[PDB]
Design a binder for these strands. Structure first.
Ligand SMILES: [Mg+2]
Ligand SMILES: [Mg+2]
Ligand SMILES: [Mg+2]
Lengths: 205, 96, 98, 126, 80, 154
RNA sequence: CGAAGAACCUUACCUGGCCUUGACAUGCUGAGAACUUUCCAGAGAUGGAUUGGUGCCUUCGGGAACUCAGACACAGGUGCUGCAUGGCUGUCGUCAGCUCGUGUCGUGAGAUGUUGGGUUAAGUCCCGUAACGAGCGCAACCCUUGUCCUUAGUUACCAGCACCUCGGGUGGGCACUCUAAGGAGACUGCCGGUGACAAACCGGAGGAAGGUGGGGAUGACGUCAAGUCAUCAUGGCCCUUACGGCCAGGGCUACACACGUGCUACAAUGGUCGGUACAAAGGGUUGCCAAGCCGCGAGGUGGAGCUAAUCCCAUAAAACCGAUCGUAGUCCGGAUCGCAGUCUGCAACUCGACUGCGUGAAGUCGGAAUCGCUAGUAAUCGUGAAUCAGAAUGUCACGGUG
């Protein structure tokens, strides 16, 4: 059922989030670094929303480009968090670490940034649909050509597992030529676990 | 010279970054030669609790690529190695 | 469990702790030119070590999950954490093919 | 010159066939033709495009074939020599298009698929 | 099995609880959980309490028991 | 059932120069053992030339046409009564019926020296005392008891 | 069938031995650097000895680092709920459908579009028409195989050239095969007939390929409160001097029976012996483990070469040639079982795999029934990989003959 919309297009649309060659004797000693970096960084940057954390390995050290749509929260008073983490990313990843920060201008057209706001609204006890009818039209005044948002879970009920489904525009999924974003962020309410899926469709080719 | 990377939109696009940037400095470097390709299939099971006949199988590639100088007189590419390494290319040197 | 990862963490210490004498005690026995008197007292030093030093007691579990079955050694991941981490573009050079 | 180069592939085989004027010199991998293909009907199948175009006595034939199976190499020569005979002209083109010799046989082996056991055989249920 | 390069097998704590326990002769059974070791002509005629799995059972050592290990003389599974 | 089936052709017999014998050779081959089955068909061909002075192709040409039948039944059920209808055997089909009957009775001949089993089968059918000829004519007798059902509820 | 590997470990269960802020997290109070102790008791857990070590940054005050004890919150749970749920997969089904906007008809639930004629693998198209449009799907976009062209020549390649010890061995060559990058080629294009001449259909030429060339990935709205709380994540509920931890042995491999898949066989399209011919694909510096060498044989020595188109794994088997075998429960078949060995591992008793020697069974093509497959396909013969100290008749994968 609906094979993951990145794993079919690694190639014709998108590329990896981490590029580095490794021998067969060190391949599984760089993965375990790069997988507990991403669990570390998102638990620290719970605010100052983060979409993508890329990692390059040049000759013998590192490079990391953390993407936020609000860089001023992370770079606060000239890198009081930047040099503080750069001391302490080396303690998990023994090479010296670079940290680079870009902007995510138009923050309402990347799926991770959108779906983090859905968990925020649905844990403030906002209505399950008034939160989302406004979170699609706002992401259609500027930008995209199609948006699907599925909201599944407890949805407040007693024994209820309904799925909200609202769509606008055009979203293909069996065209490999197209360009689709995808993100699943969850939510822990005072009862039940709500999972949210987002399918922002940018332009094709 | 021998090169190892993971996608042909880097490693066969960095040879021109070496062939042009060494033949400019006088020394003759011939055309690069392809090698056979590493191919490794990984068939993994997909269901958490068991249903065996649903599977999924991947493949990891490794492209190789060999250069060939004629007259070694340039240490220009020795300084221009951090330029010619970009993201995932490894270069072992065989300066023939 | 979590108490079960912890007891198979210290097995990896005790194997990598001694790790050199047991090469020597198995260098003595394996020689055809070795004398059995030099072999018989070498048998004494093996069995008086704690038995959690051999590699056969060691069990390569998944590093992020801990599940025993479904482990690969070209990665460090399980059978079902490897799929979720590969669809998100993390593992470099890995695609689907035919 | 008069040396003519002919290649031909069938069932993962590959045959270098050289063709030049001579007197019945049929040699393959420094072996005679009757000695190389041991006890099969394909000893005559390599001659079938040759005796169709009435040139069985008028050429030297030097063949080097690699890979493939036993009777798959014999088909590689038969496809291989037909490409070498049509370097001359297209007089024998219609004599071979009608004969069904020029087209390379595309039928290659098929891969094992999951759930199945062979390429298409699947286990028995009840 | 257990090829003749590495000839015998016996356990270390069992050996000192037998070879010294020969010097004061058979007035007690030997209670031992070990089952991986053979019996030897240094031990002909003793009394061993081999661990069943939930108790110890006595063993009358004879002269023609020499090659076989202790495991063939303790039970495992009942099947009444 | 859209009609699909095209035609594939096998016609190769260089050491004798024949066409019917090559198609007959395919009904003897088991599991792709072609070179084994090739020397048995020639092995039962030369014993006929050892037996009869005539060219043993014509013995094989005669032995087909005394095993090959003319009409046969076809149990087309009306949907409430099981009927059988004697039908005219198509001229393309009637070659393979004899060649398939011939081999299956050779395997139960019960002799020694396997090429002698098939040798005796091709000798009898130039006369009519073969078990394939007796199996031919018995099915011929089944059609005339069936001949009442030739057109009517057929 | 989770299980891509149960001798112990894994392992949850059983019998005991043994712990109580705990194997682990944070906060508190003291204590010492950490370390090394090469020792006995004990099945071990553990308990007690135990030469030694005395760091490290110093506002020189100490700090941080580790290790030991005390006490509190607690830690922990493979305990119940898959009908409290997220996540992830099966299924109908790769089946051709499933819906919306505006409009009109109907008191209303509805309906129309989406029906009719033709046609298609196809809700694919054409002509029609109170509906006009739009989305999801189908098609194409992707991969691979088959033809040719360009760019490229070592470790690959040998047509031309000498060389040779006759091995591309060597000089050499860039013709080639091969390898892999980038391209062209196929569109009912063209010919004829057929249809409303309109989609299309039947023939035809050319062409490596002819009518989605062959294969693969790609499974719509949904269904079965289908499955999983034991992969992981979580609401609640219980245990918290044990439903949690620690260590030995045992166990999951027991055994009148019944059912499911799978392998050999039942012979002469065979069985042995002696020669002899041709593959793809893949793994290997915590490894492969050659030559020589000793063994009836599995192997033991021996240590090269090797970080890989180089070195090793590594000998493809069926086929072919000659011989015997005369259709006999057998020069068939190999289960069982006695004896003797090697290999891994601390350890082959319950419980490993192979080797030698001996013994030789049932089985003479198998009821009612019942399943797989339309072409490089069924059928038959080998080879490799993952998991892995050791251990495949299974799983995945590649080729022969056809
Ligand atoms: Mg039908
Ligand atoms: Mg409909
Ligand atoms: Mg193994």
């Amino acid at each position: 059922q609906k094979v993951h919309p990145n794993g079919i297009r690694l190639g014709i649309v998108k590329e990896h989030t981490s590029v580095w060659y490794a021998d067969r004797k060190n391949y599984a000693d760089y993965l375990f670094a790069d997988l507990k970096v991403r669990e570390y960084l998102q638990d620290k940057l719970k605010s100052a929303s983060v979409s993508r954390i890329d990692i390059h390995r040049p000759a013998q050290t590192a490079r990391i480009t953390i993407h936020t749509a609000r860089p001023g929260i992370v770079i606060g008073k000239k890198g009081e968090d930047v040099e503080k983490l750069r001391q302490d990313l080396t303690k998990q990843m023994g090479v010296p670490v670079h940290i680079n920060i870009e902007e995510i201008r138009k923050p309402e057209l990347d799926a991770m940034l959108v779906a983090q706001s859905v968990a925020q609204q649905l844990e403030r006890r906002v209505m399950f649909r008034r939160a989302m009818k406004r979170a699609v039209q706002n992401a259609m005044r500027i930008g995209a050509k199609g948006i699907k948002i599925q909201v599944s879970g407890r949805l407040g009920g007693a024994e209820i597992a309904r799925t909200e489904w609202y769509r606008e525009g055009r979203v293909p999924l069996h065209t490999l030529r197209a360009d689709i974003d995808y993100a699943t962020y969850e939510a822990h309410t005072t009862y039940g676990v709500i999972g949210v899926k987002v399918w922002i469709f940018k332009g094709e080719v | 010279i021998r090169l190892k990377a993971f996608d042909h939109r880097l490693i066969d696009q960095s040879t021109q970054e070496i062939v042009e940037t060494a033949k400019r400095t006088g020394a003759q470097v011939r055309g690069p030669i392809p090698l056979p390709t590493r191919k490794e299939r990984f068939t993994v099971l997909i269901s958490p609790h068991v249903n065996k006949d649903a599977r999924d199988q991947y493949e990891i590639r490794t492209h190789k690529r060999v250069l060939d100088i004629v007259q070694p007189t340039d240490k220009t590419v020795d300084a221009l190695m951090k330029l010619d390494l970009a993201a995932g290319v490894e270069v072992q040197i065989s300066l023939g | 469990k979590e108490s079960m990862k912890n007891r198979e963490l210290k097995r990896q210490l005790t194997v990598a702790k001694y790790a050199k004498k047991r090469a020597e005690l198995k260098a003595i026995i394996a020689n055809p030119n070795s004398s059995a008197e030099e072999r018989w007292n070498a048998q004494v030093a093996l069995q008086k070590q704690p038995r959690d030093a051999s590699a056969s007691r060691l069990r390569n579990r998944c590093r992020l999950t801990g599940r025993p079955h479904g482990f690969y050694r070209k990665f460090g991941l399980s059978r079902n954490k490897l799929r979720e981490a590969a669809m998100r573009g993390d593992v470099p050079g890995l695609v689907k093919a035919s | 010159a008069t040396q003519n180069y002919g290649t031909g592939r069938r069932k993962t085989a590959t045959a270098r066939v050289f063709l030049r004027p001579g007197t019945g010199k049929i040699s393959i991998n420094n072996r005679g033709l009757d000695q190389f293909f041991g006890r099969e009907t394909a000893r005559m199948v390599v001659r079938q495009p040759l005796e169709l175009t009435e040139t069985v006595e008028k050429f030297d034939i030097f063949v080097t074939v690699v890979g493939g199976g036993v009777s798959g190499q014999a088909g590689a020569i038969r496809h291989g020599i037909t490409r070498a005979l049509i370097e001359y002209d297209e007089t024998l083109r219609s004599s071979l298009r009608k004969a069904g010799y020029v087209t390379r046989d595309a039928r290659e082996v098929e891969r094992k698929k999951v759930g199945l056991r062979k390429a298409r055989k699947r286990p028995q249920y009840s | 099995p257990r090829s003749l390069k590495k000839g015998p097998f016996i356990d270390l704590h069992l050996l000192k609880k037998v070879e010294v326990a020969v010097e004061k002769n058979d007035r007690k059974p030997i209670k031992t959980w070990s089952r991986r070791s053979m019996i030897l002509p240094h031990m002909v005629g003793l009394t061993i309490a081999v661990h069943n799995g939930r108790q110890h059972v006595p063993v009358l050592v004879n002269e023609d028991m020499v090659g076989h290990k202790l495991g063939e003389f303790a039970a495992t599974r009942t099947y009444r | 059932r859209r009609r699909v089936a095209a035609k594939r052709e096998v016609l190769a017999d260089p050491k004798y120069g024949s066409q019917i014998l090559a198609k007959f050779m395919n009904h003897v081959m088991e599991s792709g053992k072609k070179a084994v089955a090739e020397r048995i068909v020639y092995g039962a061909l030369d014993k006929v030339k050892e037996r009869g002075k005539a060219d043993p192709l014509e013995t094989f040409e005669k032995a087909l046409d005394a095993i090959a039948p003319l009409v046969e039944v076809k149990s087309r059920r009306v949907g409430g009564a099981t009927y059988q209808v004697p039908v005219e055997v198509r001229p393309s089909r009637r070659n393979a019926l004899a060649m398939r009957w011939l081999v299956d009775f050779a395997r139960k001949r019960g002799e020694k020296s396997m090429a002698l089993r098939l040798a005796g089968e091709l000798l009898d059918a130039a006369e009519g005392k073969g078990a394939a000829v007796k199996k031919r004519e018995d099915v011929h007798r089944m059609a005339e008891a069936n001949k009442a059902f030739s057109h009517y509820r057929f």
